[PDB]
Nucleic acid binder design. Structure first.
Ligand code: 0KX
Ligand code: MG
Ligand code: MG
Length: 428
DNA sequence: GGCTCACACT
DNA sequence: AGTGTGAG
């Protein structure tokens, strides 16, 4: 309960969608490159950006036309379009390539299309018994940064010189004859993550970064400290200095309104300033669960488990119809429900063959023009047959009384979003 | 900005 | 069963 019981890693692919396209098209490699969807509006919306393009200021959610003003040589790859919508199939398949490799090492929790947490606690005990008392060379950690090192009293004017000196200070001081030390466990964790990152790159051509620490939140934070193509070890001891200047919003789950209340109500900026408040005081402001979570977390302690889940629990297809393009006829709503239902059907049949399960509930969601909320409305029905016409007709049946227009041909208010989601999966 | 996913709350 | 937050 100093939050040092587990070794947890978070592995995240570098500029993932870009790398998928660069692997396929060698002309894009080692260049300023972005991935875009819907090429016809302002050149497309950027969804992923190479490190070479980031150095010109190009970011996610820029329009390509705009990104081209910062980087005129920027190269683009377009997301596949099918039935009038962006289709992410090539990136989900590439994801499967990566997840299957990691799952050879340990139990993973698929956290996104491009990252997974790894509980390495057992793999570490077993690796610590294999090298009996035998030390750990820097050569086993060729890409690892030890966060908060080097410290104290040429080389270190270069990034690779600092990395090494810190690693050397860390290793020089490790107590290897003691198999229970949390720091030693982390070190062996990092060795394993080197091997995992090497296998990923060898087997896929994709580079990634990772964090190694005692829990998910720290592992995720660590990962991003030395992107791209590097891994970062955040020990329990590094936490006070690390947290002392770490904006609250950088910690996973605190990037939104909760994080903002924490800052506003308590009158603080940094994760470390949370240590001054009693658990009861945090619970008073933020509730029993969040207050307890904050109190532990600001001291580097979190217990959320790496869940044994490699598969998504829901399979969704959605499309926005912004501004003037909002859907305004019954016929038009039906046609799009059908396009969504067809893609979903293909994805479900594949899921059923691959993963030996079937979805049993269909969720329909919409947004009406005028609504401020991402969803105006969710309704659900039975999913008894992977049949796109049935699924489309059922989703229409379920929403059609949201229609204010008595003309019945027309649809009001116009719809700015449709979403179909298969959920409540059972084995078969 | 657009297409996804997970989960807490009621 | 339905809504809202947070992430990637
Ligand atoms: N808002 C977002 C964030 C991510 N994505 C997709 C595209 C990203 O390549 C992929 C993984 O997201 P990410 O890990 O947050 N960023 P990415 O892998 O591109 O770069 P780094 O992790 O190297 O920064 O999810 C998206 O489509 N919309
Ligand atoms: Mg990534
Ligand atoms: Mg990611």
């Amino acid at each position: 309960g100093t939050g040092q019981d587990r070794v947890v890693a978070l592995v995240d692919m570098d500029c993932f969608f870009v790398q998928v396209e660069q692997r396929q098209n060698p002309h894009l490699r080692n260049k300023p490159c972005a991935v875009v969807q819907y090429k016809s509006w302002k050149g497309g919306g950027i969804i992923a950006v190479s490190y070479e393009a980031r150095a010109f200021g190009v970011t996610r959610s820029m329009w390509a036309d705009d990104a081209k003003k910062l980087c005129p040589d920027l190269l683009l790859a377009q997301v596949r379009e099918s039935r009038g919508k962006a289709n992410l199939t090539k990136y989900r398949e590439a994801s499967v390539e990566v997840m299957e490799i990691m799952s050879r090492f340990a139990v993973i929790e698929r956290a996104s299309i491009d990252e997974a947490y790894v509980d390495l606690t057992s793999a570490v005990q077993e690796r610590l018994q294999k090298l009996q008392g035998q030390p750990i060379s820097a050569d086993l950690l060729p890409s690892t940064y030890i966060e908060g090192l080097p410290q104290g009293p040429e080389e270190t004017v270069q990034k690779e010189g600092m990395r090494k000196q810190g690693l050397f200070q860390w290793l020089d001081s490790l107590q290897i004859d003691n198999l229970t030390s949390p720091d030693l466990q982390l070190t062996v964790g990092a060795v394993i993550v080197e091997e995992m990152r090497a296998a990923i790159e060898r087997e896929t051509g994709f580079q990634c970064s990772a964090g190694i620490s005692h829990n998910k939140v720290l592992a995720k934070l660590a990962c991003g400290l030395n992107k791209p193509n590097r891994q970062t070890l955040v020990s329990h001891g590094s936490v006070p200095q690390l947290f002392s200047q770490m904006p609250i919003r950088k910690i996973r789950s605190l990037g939104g309104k909760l994080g903002a209340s924490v800052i506003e109500i308590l009158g603080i900026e940094y994760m470390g300033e949370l240590t001054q408040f009693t658990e009861s005081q945090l619970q008073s402001h933020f509730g029993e669960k969040n207050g307890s979570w904050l109190y532990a977390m600001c001291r580097g302690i979190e217990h959320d488990p790496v869940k044994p889940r490699q598969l998504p629990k829901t399979i969704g297809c959605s499309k926005n119809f912004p501004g003037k393009t909002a859907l305004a006829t019954r016929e038009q709503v039906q046609w799009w429900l059908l396009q969504l239902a067809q893609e979903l059907e293909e994805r479900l049949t594949k899921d059923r063959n691959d993963n030996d399960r079937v979805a049993t509930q269909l969720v329909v969601s919409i947004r009406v023009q005028g609504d401020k909320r991402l969803s105006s409305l969710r309704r659900c029905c039975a999913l008894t047959r992977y049949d796109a016409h049935k699924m489309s007709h059922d989703a229409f049946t379920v929403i059609k009384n949201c229609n204010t227009s008595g003309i019945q041909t027309e649809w009001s208010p116009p719809l700015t979003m449709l979403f179909l989601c298969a959920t409540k999966f059972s084995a078969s």
